Design a protein around this ligand. Structure first.
Ligand code: CDL
Lengths: 57, 63
């Protein structure tokens, strides 16, 4: 009583019901480094300008 | 000019230039620390963008 599969059927992506748990860390990765702090706050003008040796702006 | 005017104008000049000098010294120390530690917004040299990684199931499982 076995029916041979049609062209296209064995290449389908199927769904599988398993009782084993999903691997939470399959790459066995350690903790990622903490990122650098982002920029935040309002952008105020430079205090007394460029401060390049004698320029006042 | 009155001596009062030149005196207090000198005080305004001295305050501005002392504040600029303190900011230059702080700028040198900030640049030194950020180049040494790499934890600031400056001296951030590029690494590879992780958004380029394909996370799809590959042809072989062990990857
Ligand atoms: C309500 C809305 C309307 C409001 C309107 C208000 C205005 C009404 C009047 C309109 C006109 C305003 C003009 C601008 C304001 C005055 C700027 C000024 O004098 O700054 C003083 C500036 C600093 O003095 P200060 O006492 O501390 O500040 C006074 C103000 O608070 C200065 O203010 P500050 O603190 O904000 O200044 C900022 C900063 C102040 O400066 C600094 O922070 C210090 C660094 C300055 C630069 C130093 C460079 C050193 C190496 C190069 C040397 C050059 C060679 C000399 C010139 C060779 C001959 C051409 O300036 C700069 O960074 C700009 C660089 C210098 C250019 C100055 C403006 C020139 C405009 C006209 C150009 C014509 C040719 C001029 C000669 C070319 C060389 C400049 O003086 C100098 O550095 C000495 C040089 C003098 C500058 C030029 C004078 C401008 C007028 C010239 C007219 C005659 C031209 C003759 C024919 C052409 C030449 C053959």
């Amino acid at each position: 009583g076995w029916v041979r599969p049609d062209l296209g059927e064995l290449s389908k992506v199927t769904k599988v019901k398993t009782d084993r748990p999903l691997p939470e860390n399959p790459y066995h990765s350690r903790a990622r480094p903490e990122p650098n702090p982002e920029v935040e706050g309002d952008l105020k003008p430079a205090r007394h300008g460029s401060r390049l040796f004698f320029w006042t702006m | 000019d009155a001596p009062e005017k030149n005196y207090e104008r000198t005080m305004a000049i001295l305050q501005i230039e002392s504040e600029k000098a303190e900011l230059r010294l702080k700028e040198l120390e900030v640049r030194r620390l950020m180049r040494a530690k790499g934890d600031g917004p400056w001296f951030q040299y590029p690494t590879i963008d992780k958004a380029l990684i394909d996370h799809s199931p590959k042809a072989t499982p062990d990857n």
